[PDB]
């Protein structure tokens, strides 16, 4: 496949062109024209890049690439190491940020719901679906469940959360700021990846169970999902590598 | 003391005028004129408020108040309950954000340094001081040190940091975004309150020990220090109340 | 350093040659001659092996390697996957079994003692040290201490143990069979890693507190200290990786 | 019945003499010639023995008796108390080990298959049957079924096992070393009583669900079934006593 | 000692005369005047009486004797066999009920707290002391702790109890009716011997852990302690005998 | 149906006013007048009440209601929660105690006998029927059969009962005090729900097999049968709900 054909293929599968974002979606750094072996992971860290070079990948696809709004375009320190590892080896880098969080099937938000056992039912706002657990359980049990399914112990705050959690809303990664919107919609628990100082007061004062189950942990689902989608719908050789990040 | 007097007293001790901020610094909600019993804390949470009410406080002073830039001005949910507890009881709410982060004597950044045994020596950027531990220790020992001093286990990332940590930079609260700037300046360790997904790659790729010691935990120092200053320089009856927040 | 050189350095520090074993101690699978980066772990599993590859290790060092007496020589299944990862990448695999259980300073046994707060005072038999807890406590209290220090709830049988445990014998890993020898010597508790059906009768009928604290959990001690020893005594770059194992 | 007659009766029903074992099968300790009341249990522990004395038994029959190969012959400590209790009271001790594991009808392996709802279909190796659950289920439901049926929560490692378990191999007691042969055979799960450190690597790297269901827990079926068969086929009064053992 | 002397001596030690009871406390069935050898136990069942005869005792002392309020006076069945064994052999039968449950030193309630490691701190109601575990633990562990100290697995209902148990109330024997009084006083656990249908709802709806640890299991303590007290304070020969009872 | 009419219908089918009881039989807490949907169960616990609320029930009928003789009338803790749920939602509570144990067709005693396979042949006293198993069996087998039909392992004491059980007497619930009455009449076994310390002695000394099969497990039959009887003879929608209770 040509690198530009692959950009167009996933752009169309994820209705990318239609979504405003904090960074460029699609081909971020151009490499050789022909793409046959693909390495993907949550973030284009130096460590993922090093696996793509070790594996002889032609392209790398991630949910967090470079060139974020507000960033300095200067190329030094980390940025110089990353771009040189890509450019010298002719590796194509693609990033799909909000389109891969939102897709109904392959997105981070839909995959978390499948992994945690939540029946999606509607959407509170663009990146915040809500639904119900198919097996309603107490706040403590839900924490252990999230810990067993993502393999990471979440920050659980449920000082004033309901006795049993049924209705839930969530947003993967750094979606702590949607907690009020979810509490205002009416839920039993709100789940996200990161947490901030104010997030705790929102859970306490609004009567809900809150979980920060990890930015990286809650965001392996979509890129892994898109990687499967590529292996089943093309002849590409796509390998998804989960490189652990505590955050 | 009069409410407007107290405002001008603390505004001048913290050179507040000369500091751009994300929210109004000073008297945020006007209550009775005469102030004598003051309750303070890290954030004007409903819980700190109900303590002010139980203690028959005339004013509450915090580091995190209301009216953050970009916030919806409508008064509903939590803002209604909070503002009603203050206006109905004639309690003055005062808040100081960045000026209480930076003051060289009473600020959260100077009080963390005192607490962890760091000799301040310069400033990399306005909210980010640098200095040297008085007793250099290996990354593991500094993590245990931070946890004993703050009473909270920090997230520590030292995959690629020096054998012994001597030079340190820091920013209390959510200053994770200052990590690359500390890296370019040159430090063995960077400490702040919260953590983001990109912060972990900044720690590994630039070879430094990183600690996320908690937003609330790294921010009890300054408003506690200011409360002492008030009890020591005025006849005001000030009680600092620490309400645990895991974030 | 030269792979054969690193083999002689550790053999001599651990007095390996003078100790008969169930498997070869030293370089078990040869790789590239020049070793500078090493990854270590309790067991040369496929998981550790994959982390060694990913981090560009030239050698892997473990407490449990391959070629155990009685095992079939044929290379198939897990053996084939494991040997290939090592051989295709020129990675040296070394292992030290009994020699790393027993070394007075760096061994598994002496390191468990320091972690648990036991003053070593002697040995009942070659892999069975004896000593006393610096702070004597009841059986139940000791169970929570071992759980807190090792990060794993131990199986505790104390149906007939003394009211306070002071004198203790122990043997990391699969040493449940040394319990009768410990009882005849005279101790209040026996601690090991695994448990067997007969172990519980031994505990009960001989009046001691028995603890099965984890084969893996009790054997991260030696390999991690041996890794600290190499970083402090050579210029090799050694990283210990703990890959959790329930047993 | 005459003590030696009962020996011969059970030796024949179980085809004992044709199975090489690690300890003597049959009458291990002679007692009064005339047998009428018999107490049975998993292991000839001091507790079962004291029970047989209290009930006035003339014999005891167990799965685990004495005299294992390589054990010291000397009679001291536990052996002295156990042998004294039997000899002073003229109580006959019988033990059948591998024969009582294997009998197609009354054996521990067949009894466990019946308890867990597994249709026996063949034999992988002598002590390791295989079959299919009459009701296939995911690995978590099976952990719960085993825990419900055995009365003990098993250790369940299934991080890489199939979504639904149907084909199963098992060996009661200490059969962990048989897991690799079951993998080669091709099964979705392997169940045994104990666990060892290498067993967890075998489950993960070969993709199967593994369960250490308890050594004593998985071995009550056989001696209990034998006890039932004697009450149905002789005029003997045989009682089975389950004396709890968590291993 | 004269039988009437021994009665007077235990009455005063236990402050018996000043306690209303459901049966006569003291000498219930008179026998020979001179008492030298005494056998004791929880209940004057036929099995106990029979040991008294075999052992040639002059007297038997229990916690549960005869003549309970409400009982038929007619002497037939069990009562005839029991009374014949005592009268024909001239054996004295003494029984102390509530006095032996309540004595602060020798009573069933004080002996259970010492067996279980509880520091007695006061009394909720006449037969229900309250106290704190010197080693607080979760409800599951306390269950295992009760099992091991008593030698019998208790029924543990802890669906809604606290995460850690510290304050506890108890009443040996059939004291399940006191669970609501304990819940009203404020406790993390209530322990007794028997259980009733309603006892479970009290536990669940009042948020405490409940344990039915055995009527007989929890009442060996008092009569055994009075037995050691007689042996230490007189020249009598008293043997306490535990005859197992499941309830 | 009108609430006072339903009361009447069941009072007459169970000949209730004729039976004197420990609590009022019939409508115990009046609710809305029109009843159409009804939830039933063994005891009016908070848990059944909350189900009745979830399900929109107009009435709840149980075997155990409130207002037992001797109980305090005050409404607090548990009674307040329960009564508030009923009264605030206008749910009628009806309860029938002894008339629901005794009815020849629908009662707990007759329904247990149909379940267990016993032909009822007459009665010893009011709540204690007697009969014979259609298939006589040893007491061990009877234990296993009771466990299979009721779903709970019973306590079986058969130390001294007949080799085979044929004639049986039984009382569901707390009927242990009837065991001496069954023995004098002449039976092989006596079956009830709960057990008490003295019941074990009655069993041993009177030579009968005794089974405590569970107060809750033996009392589902009646209210379940009454609920079917209401669905078949009225237009009411009745749902019997089993809320497990181990006692
Ligand atoms: Mg995202
Ligand atoms: Mg801040
Ligand atoms: Mg700040
Ligand atoms: Mg080992
Ligand atoms: Mg070892
Ligand atoms: Mg075995
Ligand atoms: Mg076996
Ligand atoms: Mg009693
Ligand atoms: Mg009592
Ligand atoms: Mg009843
Ligand atoms: Mg009843």
UniProtKB/Swiss-Prot annotation, chains A, B, C, D, E, F:
Q: Is DNA repair tagged as a keyword?
A: yes
In terms of domain of life, where is this protein from?
Bacteria
Coiled-coil segments, which residues? none
Q: Does the keyword DNA damage apply?
A: yes
A single MF term (Gene Ontology): metal ion binding
**Record key words, sorted:** DNA damage, DNA repair, Metal-binding
Q: What is this protein called?
A: GTP cyclohydrolase 1 type 2 homolog
Species name: Escherichia coli O157:H7
Q: What is the lineage of its organism?
A: Bacteria, Pseudomonadati, Pseudomonadota, Gammaproteobacteria, Enterobacterales
